[PDB]
Copies of this chain bind each other. A is one copy, B any other.
Amino acid sequence: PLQQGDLNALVTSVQSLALNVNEILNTVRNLDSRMNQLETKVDRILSSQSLIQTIKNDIVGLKAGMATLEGM
The complex is assembled from copies of this chain, and their number is 4
Contact size range, A: 35 or more
**A67 closest partner in B (C-beta):** B65
**In contact, B46 and A56 (Cβ under 8 angstroms):** no
* Chain B residues, CB < 8 A from A45: 42, 45-46, 49
**In contact, A2 and B7 (Cβ under 8 angstroms):** yes
**In contact, B41 and A43 (Cβ under 8 angstroms):** yes
**A28 closest partner in B (C-beta):** B27
Min CB distance A45 to B, Å, is 6
Q: Which positions in A face B, CB cutoff 8 Å?
A: 1-4, 6-11, 13-18, 20-25, 27-32, 34-39, 41-46, 48-56, 58-63, 65-70, 72
